């Protein structure tokens, strides 16, 4: 048994739950999410092997035209845990109770094993993203007084939105080795507040572990938003943004072979 979703054959917005114990509460949810592609030729397909646990993405898209060039990237094919606030999809069968208020959450490690193969110079990142919203069970998008936080652990040729704030150093684990890694902190106004942490030494494949609160505490600390502790950390999404307006061909393959969220006995926001 292999779960398969495919653009364009399954429609504009292919996606599916991953629900191992068939309890109607998925452990994860996957989406091809070509959200700024207006038209393209070719296909993108994601499969999830229900026995090996391997998620594999193959994308061969050409003649790409974007919905809105100012939104810059083409899409973000991804797997996520929690409530994704832009639609009715969710996955909450896991150890971290997302969505919950930031002020109520425990810290946790996020560990991902993956391997990226962008082709032909394609601008891409591998980025973890969370939305922070005033409503826990939002399904209709994001307002100007809410936040998006991204953590980029790989990039080539893509830059985050907005402007550079500072650099921080965060203890992470890369392929089993503790490393004090430097991230650039970027902050933008793009319809809501955006904060991205772009690592300075990108990791194209392997197993990387981050302490999630190191990043959410900085995003809180630098926010312009009012009543930040009212916000719900909705989800943790993991995927690859790819393309810029210079890109008309985007061929990419990747694999994610494990995602683990590990609770810690300390608050999320330090
Ligand atoms: Ca389930
Ligand atoms: Ca949702």
TrEMBL record:
GO terms for molecular function: cellulase activity; metal ion binding. Ca(2+) 1 binds at residues 19, 21, 23, 25, 27, 93. Keywords: Calcium, Metal-binding. Ca(2+) 3 binds at residue 249. One of its GO terms (biological process) is polysaccharide catabolic process. The keyword Calcium applies. Ca(2+) 2 binds at residues 83-84, 87, 89. The keyword Glycoprotein does not apply. Belongs to the glycosyl hydrolase 12 (cellulase H) family. This is Endoglucanase A. It comes from Pyrococcus furiosus. The chain holds residues 50 to 319 of 319 of the full protein.
């Amino acid at each position: 048994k292999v779960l398969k979703i495919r653009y364009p054959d399954d429609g504009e917005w292919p996606g599916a739950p991953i629900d191992k114990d068939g309890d109607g509460n998925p452990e994860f949810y996957i989406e091809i999410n070509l959200w700024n592609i207006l038209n393209a030729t070719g296909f993108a397909e994601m499969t999830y092997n229900l026995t090996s646990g391997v998620l594999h993405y193959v994308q061969q898209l050409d003649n790409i035209v974007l919905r809105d060039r100012s939104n810059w990237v083409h899409g973000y094919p991804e797997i996520f845990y929690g409530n994704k606030p832009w639609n009715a999809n969710y996955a909450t069968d896991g150890p971290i109770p997302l969505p919950s208020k930031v002020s109520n959450l425990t810290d946790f490690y996020l560990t991902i094993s993956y391997k990226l193969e962008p082709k032909n110079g394609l601008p891409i990142n591998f980025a973890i993203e969370s939305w922070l919203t005033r409503e826990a069970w939002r399904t209709t998008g994001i307002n100007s007084d809410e936040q998006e936080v991204m953590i980029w652990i790989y990039y080539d040729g893509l830059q985050p939105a907005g402007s550079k704030v500072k650099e921080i150093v965060v203890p992470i684990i890369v392929n089993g080795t503790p490393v004090n890694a430097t991230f650039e902190v970027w902050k933008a106004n793009i319809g809501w507040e955006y904060v991205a942490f772009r690592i300075k030494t990108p990791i194209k494949e392997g197993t990387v572990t981050i302490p999630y609160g190191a990043f959410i505490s900085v995003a809180a600390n630098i926010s312009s938003l009012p009543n930040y502790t009212e916000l719900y950390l909705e989800d943790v999404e993991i995927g690859t943004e790819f393309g810029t307006p210079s890109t008309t061909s985007a061929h990419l393959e990747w694999w994610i072979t494990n995602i683990t969220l590990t609770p810690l006995d300390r608050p999320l926001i330090s």
